[PDB]
Structure 1
Amino acid sequence: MAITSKKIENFSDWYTQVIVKSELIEYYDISGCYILRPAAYYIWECVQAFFNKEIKKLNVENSYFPLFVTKNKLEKEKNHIEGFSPEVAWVTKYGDSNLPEEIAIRPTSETIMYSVFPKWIRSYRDLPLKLNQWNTVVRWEFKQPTPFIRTREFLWQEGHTAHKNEEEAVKLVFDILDLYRRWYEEYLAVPIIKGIKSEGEKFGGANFTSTAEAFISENGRAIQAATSHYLGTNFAKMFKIEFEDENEVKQYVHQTSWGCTTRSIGIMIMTHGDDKGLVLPPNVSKYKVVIVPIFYKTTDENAIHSYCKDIEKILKNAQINCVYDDRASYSPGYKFNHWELRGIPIRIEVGPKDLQNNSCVIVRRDNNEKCNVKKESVLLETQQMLVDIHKNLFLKAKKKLDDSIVQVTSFSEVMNALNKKKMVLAPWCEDIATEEEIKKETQRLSLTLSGAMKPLCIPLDQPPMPPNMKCFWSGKPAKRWCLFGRSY
């Protein structure tokens, strides 16, 4: 019924409380895995629809290749309940693993896909080839887990393409990346930084890895929001995926992979959450409005029930989903808290002092600003409000993000900024040994999760690099500006 830990002071328990007490998830008694209740799934359905539309515009074609992961990752269920997640249940009776270990570690159809691709691509006429699929996997949950965020249970999407060029493929990679950005912004009202990964933090089979980075202020921790890989000809060469060009001479396809996950949900939740509880941006909230009757002393309760039902009509007629809470058992206060907690964007309160006034009151979930509004304005005003709540969420989020970055030019400044829950943006020479040197040094200077500072991304929107500038670590000429930060 209420939230005991304050977000800014006991973050982890705050998150726990919020997601279980907001009817988002439900834990099974066994395996520590959770049910995505309608409340949670709805979000996924929204972003899923969005993505599908947008990649259809990109001539991506949905499909399904059976997922493979090495047997070893599924043993904990095999011993505990003798059952596996249905999407990868075949991989046990498979026996010996195959082929490269670098991909078998993670559930994917890449192992299968790449295997059948050379038979699908023989001519240049067969390119470009653009596939997508939606996946769900669940393994025996971590001992100390964080739903959406640090968990073995996932619901995600993975795309794969093959091209005649590198230009084609890379363009595509960044197109997808910007779709992930829109994914987070237009729908989860979450801001992210577009960037390229350090050579040590990139995917090994990748030429380069582009990422969307998000940042949790209350933790002072960054977390990867989405990834788009330019794979190059690595796996073409590896799997003999060649085609015959227009001049009719055999050449290697250029591939890309990309994927975003239910992680996004958790990230959203961490971005907008109150001590009051859940705050959904309206696009991903099943009900946009809850309608509450306020009355204690005896009155025409019927008159109100009707007035309210009239508002509910006005709105459900605009395909704006409402819930009217006329429960007799609970105080108007109880209700307030109950739906504030479940993350409903707008609450309309109806009072006897509003039926003779023919108005009502509307309250925003995000800033709890109240206002008085006439009945005929209700629909309009509610709409404009549902837009504004979103813009506002995205703003406060963005500001927090912007405030969490410190531009340093030397290592002196680093640790300070770190302990203030900030990430730094620093002139790096991007040489590799320095990654591990910086990890080890920053781990050694700090007071679950790690304290070592990792290179997160080289952001696409680069600050000018002075001709002089040295790497804040090596003292070599700095190559580019890089985000370092503690992370998930």
Structure 2
Amino acid sequence: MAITSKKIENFSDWYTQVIVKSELIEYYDISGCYILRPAAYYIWECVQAFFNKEIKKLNVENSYFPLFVTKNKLEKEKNHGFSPEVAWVTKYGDSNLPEEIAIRPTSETIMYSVFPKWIRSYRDLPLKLNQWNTVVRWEFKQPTPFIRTREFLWQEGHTAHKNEEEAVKLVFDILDLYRRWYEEYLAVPIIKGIKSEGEKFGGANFTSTAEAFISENGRAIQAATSHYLGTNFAKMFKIEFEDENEVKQYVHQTSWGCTTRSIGIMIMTHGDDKGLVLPPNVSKYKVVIVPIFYKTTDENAIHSYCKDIEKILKNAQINCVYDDRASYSPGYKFNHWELRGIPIRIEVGPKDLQNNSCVIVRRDNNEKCNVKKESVLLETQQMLVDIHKNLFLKAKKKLDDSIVQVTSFSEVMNALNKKKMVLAPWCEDIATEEEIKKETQRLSLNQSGAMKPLCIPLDQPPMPPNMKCFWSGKPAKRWCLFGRSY
């Protein structure tokens, strides 16, 4: 088992190979659904634990609402173009249901229908809820393991506040928790930003977003969402509270979500030609121990040594595996565990046993270092930190190198052709969005190739005071990130 396609040459097939052979997923006889094996789900558990800790600090309470929602309830607020993606239960056994029932594609209509019962006065606020659940969307866009799946795991938070300031504050708090969840657990850098009027969630006042970029195929991917919903849903669902004068006021809402797409983003960011590369924080085993016998008499000495090292790491709660299987060569094992993304390999040969040393090898850059057994615990600890740092830094470099700043449309296509995004001064007129889509599609016929507004970044470079929009020529308001996406 080896990775047959190179990441830069054939990214799609490299991806499918990596995720199957590293034992993250199995494919399934229902298109767009994938089995999450222990190695994948472990990553989900880690980020889940982190995120739970941090939102409980914000006093968000977990909850669980039904998987099913009635047609009447799901469809109450007009359509507001999701309808072909709804999966419908039409019967139980061989008996038709009087009315069909939908599986949740998200929980707005389920939760907000009961919010008025729970919110009567200003004394009931804020209301802060989260769910860890599964949803179903029958994606017609190309399904891709983790990135776009028809059933996926995720978290949805919904809150309601007495005013705008408090809700918006929470929207950005959540957003930085997403930043930390990418950075600290997946070693993935993201760009924070505000979605254009064309790209935001229809029900939202504004949509803030974390964007990632896969440099290897030049594609941006939305990494997480955090919305200021204002009073839009409060009006739709009649969610009001009597204020301190017993005057009825609309709540100010937020919602926010992040999915197993994250695992996908992480795989694509750090994976190399040898396979999966895991940040230590989301790998079950931090270290693999591999014995080496240069045709040596005593297997048992080396075995006992290896065992000692394993006990040292395990006792320090650094989980590890000792691969003592007789039926595979050391080289086989090196490759096998590289493919599975074990952050550190420790090799023990006969020479090492004589010197009370061992050889430590980093998954990320393949650097080796002979070190004394009695120092392995401190070395390992530090190395697991270094690895994370390295991964993050490398990813950040690629991210920063993927942003070409431009001032006129004339520079754009070149940039797109080099698998980059563009940062451009933009008038933000809603009409220009589809225009820019159409033109970049058309011009891509020569080189979907359309580029779209990814986000208005929080980190704006200086805007020269007479600067014009790259596209319309009108006055430019802010810098916007554009690029091709998933």
Give the Cα–Cα distance (whole angstroms) in 2 for the partners of residues 242 and 167 of structure 1: 17
- Relative to structure 1, the CA distance from residue 105 to residue 442 in structure 2 (aligned partners, 3 Å threshold; closer, same or farther) is farther
Give the Cα–Cα distance (whole angstroms) in 2 for the partners of residues 75 and 203 of structure 1: 17
Shift of 1:391: 0.2
- Relative to structure 1, the CA distance from residue 396 to residue 57 in structure 2 (aligned partners, 3 Å threshold; closer, same or farther) is same
Give the Cα–Cα distance (whole angstroms) in 1 for the partners of residues 437 and 95 of structure 2: 33
> Is 454-463 or 131-140 further displaced after alignment?
131-140
After superposition, give the CA deviation of every residue in 1:177-229 in whole Å (9 maximum; x if it has no partner): 00000010000000000000000000110000000000000110000000001
After superposition, give the CA deviation of every residue in 1:415-446 in whole Å (9 maximum; x if it has no partner): 00000000000000001111111000000011
- Relative to structure 1, the CA distance from residue 270 to residue 254 in structure 2 (aligned partners, 3 Å threshold; closer, same or farther) is same
Contact 1:98 1:104 in 2 (8 A): no
Q: Aligned with 1:93: secondary structure?
A: strand
Shift of 1:137: 3.3
Match of 2:433 in 1: 435
Give the Cα–Cα distance (whole angstroms) in 1 for the partners of residues 462 and 255 of structure 2: 30
Q: Aligned with 1:190: secondary structure?
A: coil
Contact 2:104 2:135 in 1 (8 A): no
Shift of 1:112: 1.7
Shift of 1:240: 1.2
Shift of 1:71: 6.8
Shift of 1:139: 6.3
Q: Aligned with 1:160: secondary structure?
A: strand
Q: Aligned with 1:430: secondary structure?
A: coil
Q: Aligned with 2:166: secondary structure?
A: helix
Shift of 1:300: 1.4
Contact 1:87 1:137 in 2 (8 A): no
Q: Aligned with 1:225: secondary structure?
A: strand
Contact 2:85 2:137 in 1 (8 A): no
Give the Cα–Cα distance (whole angstroms) in 2 for the partners of residues 335 and 291 of structure 1: 10
Contact 1:209 1:230 in 2 (8 A): yes
Q: Aligned with 1:271: secondary structure?
A: helix
Match of 1:34 in 2: 34
Contact 1:360 1:375 in 2 (8 A): yes
Q: Aligned with 2:129: secondary structure?
A: strand
Contact 2:456 2:479 in 1 (8 A): yes
Contact 1:71 1:97 in 2 (8 A): no
After superposition, give the CA deviation of every residue in 1:276-295 in whole Å (9 maximum; x if it has no partner): 00000000000000000111
- Relative to structure 1, the CA distance from residue 107 to residue 473 in structure 2 (aligned partners, 3 Å threshold; closer, same or farther) is same
**Unpaired segments ≥5 residues, structure 1:** none
Shift of 1:448: 17
Contact 1:468 1:477 in 2 (8 A): yes
The normalised TM-score by structure 2 is 0.93
Contact 2:200 2:207 in 1 (8 A): yes
- Relative to structure 1, the CA distance from residue 282 to residue 464 in structure 2 (aligned partners, 3 Å threshold; closer, same or farther) is same
Match 1:98 to one of 96, 99, 104: 96
Shift of 1:327: 0.7
Contact 1:33 1:140 in 2 (8 A): no
Shift of 1:28: 3.1
After superposition, give the CA deviation of every residue in 1:26-79 in whole Å (9 maximum; x if it has no partner): 123455632111100000000000010000000000001114568799999999
Q: Aligned with 2:88: secondary structure?
A: helix
- Relative to structure 1, the CA distance from residue 248 to residue 99 in structure 2 (aligned partners, 3 Å threshold; closer, same or farther) is farther
Cα RMSD, aligned residues only: 4.8
Match of 1:270 in 2: 268
Match of 2:162 in 1: 164
- Relative to structure 1, the CA distance from residue 129 to residue 318 in structure 2 (aligned partners, 3 Å threshold; closer, same or farther) is same
Contact 2:86 2:102 in 1 (8 A): no
Q: Aligned with 2:32: secondary structure?
A: coil
> Is 241-250 or 357-366 further displaced after alignment?
241-250
- Relative to structure 1, the CA distance from residue 74 to residue 250 in structure 2 (aligned partners, 3 Å threshold; closer, same or farther) is closer
Match of 2:310 in 1: 312
Q: Aligned with 2:221: secondary structure?
A: strand
> Is 48-57 or 147-156 further displaced after alignment?
147-156
Shift of 1:377: 0.4
Contact 1:164 1:254 in 2 (8 A): yes
Alignment of 1:300-379 (within 5 A): 300-379=298-377
User: Does residue 485 of the first structure (1) align with residue 483 of the second (2)?
Assistant: yes
Q: Aligned with 1:56: secondary structure?
A: helix
- Relative to structure 1, the CA distance from residue 2 to residue 235 in structure 2 (aligned partners, 3 Å threshold; closer, same or farther) is same
Contact 1:243 1:252 in 2 (8 A): yes
Contact 1:194 1:460 in 2 (8 A): yes
After superposition, give the CA deviation of every residue in 1:7-40 in whole Å (9 maximum; x if it has no partner): 0100000000000011111123455632111100
Shift of 1:447: 3.9
Give the Cα–Cα distance (whole angstroms) in 1 for the partners of residues 451 and 99 of structure 2: 28
Match of 1:3 in 2: 3
Contact 1:454 1:486 in 2 (8 A): yes
Give the Cα–Cα distance (whole angstroms) in 1 for the partners of residues 305 and 75 of structure 2: 59
- Relative to structure 1, the CA distance from residue 389 to residue 77 in structure 2 (aligned partners, 3 Å threshold; closer, same or farther) is farther
Alignment of 1:241-252 (within 5 A): 241-252=239-250
Contact 2:87 2:136 in 1 (8 A): no
Give the Cα–Cα distance (whole angstroms) in 2 for the partners of residues 84 and 173 of structure 1: 24
What is the number of equivalent residue pairs in this alignment? 486
- Relative to structure 1, the CA distance from residue 26 to residue 445 in structure 2 (aligned partners, 3 Å threshold; closer, same or farther) is same
Contact 1:197 1:211 in 2 (8 A): yes
Give the Cα–Cα distance (whole angstroms) in 2 for the partners of residues 101 and 231 of structure 1: 31
- Relative to structure 1, the CA distance from residue 401 to residue 100 in structure 2 (aligned partners, 3 Å threshold; closer, same or farther) is farther
Give the Cα–Cα distance (whole angstroms) in 1 for the partners of residues 446 and 104 of structure 2: 22
Shift of 1:450: 1.5
Match of 1:380 in 2: 378
Shift of 1:258: 0.3
Shift of 1:298: 2.7
> Is 195-204 or 98-107 further displaced after alignment?
98-107
Shift of 1:238: 1.2
Contact 2:424 2:479 in 1 (8 A): yes
Give the Cα–Cα distance (whole angstroms) in 2 for the partners of residues 387 and 186 of structure 1: 11
Contact 2:146 2:263 in 1 (8 A): yes
- Relative to structure 1, the CA distance from residue 430 to residue 97 in structure 2 (aligned partners, 3 Å threshold; closer, same or farther) is farther
After superposition, give the CA deviation of every residue in 1:125-175 in whole Å (9 maximum; x if it has no partner): 000000000111356786953101132121000000000010000000000
The normalised TM-score by structure 1 is 0.92
- Relative to structure 1, the CA distance from residue 74 to residue 282 in structure 2 (aligned partners, 3 Å threshold; closer, same or farther) is farther
- Relative to structure 1, the CA distance from residue 412 to residue 70 in structure 2 (aligned partners, 3 Å threshold; closer, same or farther) is farther
Q: Aligned with 1:436: secondary structure?
A: helix
Percent identity between matched residues is: 100
- Relative to structure 1, the CA distance from residue 148 to residue 101 in structure 2 (aligned partners, 3 Å threshold; closer, same or farther) is farther
Give the Cα–Cα distance (whole angstroms) in 2 for the partners of residues 105 and 276 of structure 1: 39
Shift of 1:299: 2.6
Contact 2:424 2:481 in 1 (8 A): yes
Contact 2:289 2:306 in 1 (8 A): yes
> Is 64-73 or 433-442 further displaced after alignment?
64-73
Give the Cα–Cα distance (whole angstroms) in 1 for the partners of residues 272 and 72 of structure 2: 40
